[PDB]
Design an enzyme around this catalytic site. Structure first.
Site, PDB file in Angstrom:
ATOM      1  N   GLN A 138       0.830  -1.192   0.000  1.00  0.00           N
ATOM      2  CA  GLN A 138       0.000   0.000   0.000  1.00  0.00           C
ATOM      3  C   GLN A 138       0.869   1.248   0.000  1.00  0.00           C
ATOM      4  OE1 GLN A 138      -3.256  -1.542  -0.893  1.00  0.00           O
ATOM      5  NE2 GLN A 138      -3.665   0.451   0.049  1.00  0.00           N
ATOM      6  N   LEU A 162       0.953   4.234  -1.187  1.00  0.00           N
ATOM      7  CA  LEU A 162      -0.206   4.885  -1.777  1.00  0.00           C
ATOM      8  C   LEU A 162      -0.034   6.395  -1.847  1.00  0.00           C
ATOM      9  CD1 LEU A 162      -2.822   3.479  -2.807  1.00  0.00           C
ATOM     10  CD2 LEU A 162      -3.955   4.208  -0.713  1.00  0.00           C
ATOM     11  N   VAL A 163       1.173   6.896  -1.595  1.00  0.00           N
ATOM     12  CA  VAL A 163       1.448   8.324  -1.607  1.00  0.00           C
ATOM     13  C   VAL A 163       2.808   8.532  -2.256  1.00  0.00           C
ATOM     14  CG1 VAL A 163       2.655   8.549   0.592  1.00  0.00           C
ATOM     15  CG2 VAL A 163       1.213  10.443  -0.224  1.00  0.00           C
ATOM     16  N   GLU A 197       5.414  10.479  -1.084  1.00  0.00           N
ATOM     17  CA  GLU A 197       6.570  10.479  -0.197  1.00  0.00           C
ATOM     18  C   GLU A 197       6.957   9.068   0.214  1.00  0.00           C
ATOM     19  OE1 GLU A 197       6.205  12.441   3.563  1.00  0.00           O
ATOM     20  OE2 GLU A 197       5.145  10.767   4.499  1.00  0.00           O
ATOM     21  N   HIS A 220       3.614  -0.812  -7.976  1.00  0.00           N
ATOM     22  CA  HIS A 220       3.455   0.507  -7.386  1.00  0.00           C
ATOM     23  C   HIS A 220       4.749   1.298  -7.407  1.00  0.00           C
ATOM     24  CE1 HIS A 220      -0.206  -1.358  -5.575  1.00  0.00           C
ATOM     25  NE2 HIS A 220      -0.675  -0.140  -5.773  1.00  0.00           N
ATOM     26  N   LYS A 253       6.319   3.526 -10.988  1.00  0.00           N
ATOM     27  CA  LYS A 253       5.706   4.804 -11.338  1.00  0.00           C
ATOM     28  C   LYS A 253       6.506   5.994 -10.818  1.00  0.00           C
ATOM     29  CE  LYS A 253       1.320   2.573 -10.558  1.00  0.00           C
ATOM     30  NZ  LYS A 253       0.094   2.532  -9.713  1.00  0.00           N
ATOM     31  N   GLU A 270     -12.569 -14.602 -32.801  1.00  0.00           N
ATOM     32  CA  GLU A 270     -13.221 -15.624 -31.992  1.00  0.00           C
ATOM     33  C   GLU A 270     -14.416 -16.262 -32.687  1.00  0.00           C
ATOM     34  OE1 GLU A 270     -14.190 -14.789 -28.019  1.00  0.00           O
ATOM     35  OE2 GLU A 270     -12.269 -13.881 -27.475  1.00  0.00           O
ATOM     36  N   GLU A 320     -10.600 -29.329 -35.942  1.00  0.00           N
ATOM     37  CA  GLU A 320      -9.147 -29.293 -35.835  1.00  0.00           C
ATOM     38  C   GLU A 320      -8.601 -30.609 -35.310  1.00  0.00           C
ATOM     39  OE1 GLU A 320      -7.407 -27.304 -37.326  1.00  0.00           O
ATOM     40  OE2 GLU A 320      -9.078 -25.969 -37.808  1.00  0.00           O
TER      41      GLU A 320
END
EC number: 3.2.2.6
Lengths: 588, 454
Positions: free
Chosen positions: A67, A69-70, A72, A107, A110, A487, A530
């Site tokens: 996580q 998530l910021v 810093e 994460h 980035k 398909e 096939e």
């Protein structure tokens, strides 16, 4: 806004975070807050725990560290993020915290480029590429976005390394996986990004995972669902590519259909994605991308009037005015109409006519203009004028040449009478300003089945087929697969030819693969077709079993009874290095 | 609109050919834009219907009409249909006899040529679309079928890369004794912007069709015309030019009556002999080519019929007022479209014009330049590029180079005679089959219908 408690801290056994020490409060929380306590929440102790023995606590702390998530927190780990890489290298064992460390990497890319270089160099890509080999609905959705980040964030010095390590090949199975449509999106975005530095487009196309982007975005819907991805997606719908413009347009219609539930219509005004969308609609020869872009631009505003007519040499004042609208020259739409600018007074235009009459004083604006005029003269349909089909003789030297076709056929020059032209004639009359283009035109004018085939269950054996394809392609064998084309290909021909032309035939036997094929004595099921055509040559058919019970021959119709007579090689999801090398000798 | 759904596609995909026929008959009504878009998104069951249903089972009247309605979409649809056995069906069913199936195949081919760009016209003609489109033009019944076939051939004969092959077919010239007879009282989305390039062509077999279809679509325009749509497509100006320099009567009558329906018939087909106009004739021509505004200046400088064939950019820049170099690029476009039509007989002694128009029909404009300086057939092997550029006014270096180079160096296999009212249908098919089988063929009505003379 709302407030989260300061949870107690033990440092006794790390068992206190068996529930991550704070689930569903600031972490795993889904309320109207949406803000993580990750800021000032968590400290260096997690790095120590990953560095620690007792793999259970390693797993717990890695799960927690998923996580970041910021900003810093990413910076602070990047300052000391080597325990991550040791976790990667020592932890490649199928012990199932790869779901955690791969997400950390996802994460982690980035951040700035240097992080990506050090990770890729120090066995970072090795882990994500190795865990694009393991089966999991959530680990793969981590590896895919990890690779997409490493390509989209990191510059060319790392994209080239990724592709050297065959990132596109190992990213093929993630795209060609029937389940987890979001995984297919997150793989095709990464391949589209990798196919946007021209130094690599050759290799990415060699992989085979690029074209598969088109029959993936043509089906799904912008209702399906990276910091500032937009300034890093616009170079996907500015590309000279279809497999990448479709992804750019789809991701941008997604991130304009979920922009605060209502859009913002200013962020796209700064990134300037709306204008590139307009020229994606206008000169578009496709329906997929020209529909995605159309609805995205409608969400934002001012759909372009037309996909303009492909035949420039016969426009009139009206069509030219409409085009000037479509390319930001609406301000000059008056002057190109005060001078009756026909569709030749727009392909035989030059800088003095613009400088004096049309008003385009600013040399920058006549550099922009000729940028757009070249993007339109390479799109035009020189059929009403180009007798000897010069345009194809030009676009076969440098696709930026085609713009000169009209110049070379408003002066009689054709395929025959071109071996007798000289640079003075090209410059003054044909208007071929750049000396290098003149030199190349004069020079070029004066001188004048895949190795193996996998047929499989299109619902359960696709996952194994993807890995077999990529393993054997990295082992020097060319491979053809069904869904690289479509398909709905139930019709007979257009693929059986390769089936007999195939030099081998490996069949993925997943459990219950014969449910639909059974009772189809008509041979209507075209993979049962096939399987029937597998015995056509006896061309070293090597079945690959995966937990599928080996059925008795008598229930199995005689058109495919003899297929089971060949031995079925066991496949293990682990130790695939051993299985593939076992399979190679069965190939020829 | 919001009427009908995907179930029709499922029914076409289904067995029990009777329900296939019924659903295809229903699907022949793709009568709105979005329905065409939505089928194009999944329009492969159509192609499987085409292929598996090639049997003469008579729902070809339905699936061919679906295609007819289906090509009108963007180019990519046409490419994917033509590539995946789409043209194969329409070309195969231009072999079957039916008064309504053929009127579907013909307009299907006309759409595929007119909508689809050159990448598909070239493929059509490679597949001999013009040949298989000949019988549809040469069928005595269904005059609307003859129109819908000759429009398709006229469209195909408007990309110069193909005009050779289309003329090789033999179905092109048959357009002329087809529109000279019928009458605008006989009867594609925005066909007009796709018809104007049929009467801008340098062709007769295509200008006649362009003019006839446009007089049709101006004689049935809301029962009364609109006189604004043609003002935007700019078909009226090209019609004025179609009348003026026209050497024919068919196209110059169709264009005349269409332009009368819209307004302002041209003063006349101007005299073919430019080298001897005067102020008056030049003023009338300046009227006819949109330069009416500058007429005054060309009458203030007594611009004779040599002061309009020996004109250059400095005389126009200073005196005549045309400052805007764009307008003097337009003007020399029109001056070239008149100097290639003119009758250099009062000046061209040694008949140089035919020696020029035999290199590149855009050369003929230079004839007067080369005979206002004495140059003739004999004394031309002694001219040099400086002399050509300064005196003869041959500005484009490539034209000078070609003129100097060229001046320095210096029965059908089978015949079908037939009943002209019952055996024509069989004769057409025999002709096209044997032409595709390597036999040259002559037919009666390629010339006329009244050729009773011996």
């Amino acid at each position: 806004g709302a407030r989260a408690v300061g949870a107690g801290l033990a440092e006794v056994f790390q068992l206190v975070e068996e529930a991550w020490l704070l689930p569903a409060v600031g972490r795993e929380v889904a309320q109207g807050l949406c803000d993580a306590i990750r800021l000032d929440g968590g400290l260096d102790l997690l790095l120590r725990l990953l560095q620690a023995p007792e793999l259970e606590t390693r797993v717990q702390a890695a799960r927690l560290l998923e996580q970041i998530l910021v900003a810093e927190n990413r910076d602070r780990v990047a300052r000391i993020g080597l325990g991550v890489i040791l976790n990667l290298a020592k932890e490649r064992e199928p012990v199932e915290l790869a779901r955690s460390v791969a997400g950390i990497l996802e994460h982690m890319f980035k951040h700035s480029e240097e992080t990506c270089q050090r990770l890729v160099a120090a066995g970072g890509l090795d882990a994500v590429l190795y865990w694009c080999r393991r089966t999991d609905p959530a680990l793969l959705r981590h590896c895919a976005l990890a690779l997409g980040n490493c390509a989209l964030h990191g510059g060319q010095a790392v994209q080239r390394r990724m592709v050297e390590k065959r990132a596109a090949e190992w990213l093929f199975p993630l795209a060609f996986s029937k389940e987890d449509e979001l995984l297919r999106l997150h793989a095709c975005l990464a391949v589209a990004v990798l196919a946007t530095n021209k130094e690599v487009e050759r290799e990415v196309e060699r992989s085979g995972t690029l074209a598969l982007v088109e029959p993936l975005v043509a089906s799904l819907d912008p209702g399906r669902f990276g910091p500032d991805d937009l300034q890093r997606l616009v170079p996907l719908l500015d590309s000279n590519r279809l497999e990448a413009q479709c992804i750019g347009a789809f991701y941008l219609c997604a991130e304009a259909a979920i922009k605060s539930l209502q859009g913002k219509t200013k962020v796209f005004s700064d990134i300037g994605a709306i204008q590139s969308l307009k020229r994606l609609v206008s000169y578009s020869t496709n329906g997929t991308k020209s529909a995605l872009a159309k609805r995205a631009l409608r969400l934002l505003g001012e759909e372009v009037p037309r996909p303009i007519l492909p035949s420039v040499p016969s426009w009139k004042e009206a069509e030219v005015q409409t085009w000037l609208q479509q390319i930001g020259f609406s301000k000059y739409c008056e002057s190109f109409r005060e001078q009756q600018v026909d569709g030749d007074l727009l392909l035989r235009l030059t800088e003095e006519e613009l400088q004096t009459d049309l008003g385009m004083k600013s040399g920058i604006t006549r550099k922009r203009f000729f940028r757009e005029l070249t993007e339109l003269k390479t799109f035009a349909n020189y059929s009403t004028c180009d007798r000897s089909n010069l345009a194809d003789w030009l676009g076969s030297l440098d696709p930026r040449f085609r713009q000169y076709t009209y110049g070379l056929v408003s002066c009689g020059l054709d395929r025959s009478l071109l071996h007798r032209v000289s640079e003075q004639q090209l410059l003054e009359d044909c208007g071929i300003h750049l000396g290098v283009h003149r030199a190349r035109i004069l020079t070029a004018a004066r001188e004048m089945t895949p190795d193996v085939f996998i047929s499989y269950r299109r619902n359960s054996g696709s996952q194994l087929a993807s890995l077999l394809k990529v393993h054997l392609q990295l082992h020097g064998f060319s491979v053809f697969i069904d869904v690289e084309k479509l398909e709905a290909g139930k019709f007979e021909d257009k693929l059986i030819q390769s089936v007999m032309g195939a030099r081998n035939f490996v069949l993925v036997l997943s459990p219950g693969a014969l449910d639909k094929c059974m009772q189809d004595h008509d041979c209507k099921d075209w993979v049962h077709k096939e399987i029937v055509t597998a015995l056509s040559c006896g061309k070293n058919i090597v079945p690959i079993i995966d937990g599928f019970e080996w059925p008795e021959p008598q229930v199995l119709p005689e058109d495919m009874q003899a297929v089971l007579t060949f031995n079925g090689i066991k496949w293990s999801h682990e130790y695939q290095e051993a299985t593939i090398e076992k399979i190679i000798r069965f190939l020829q």
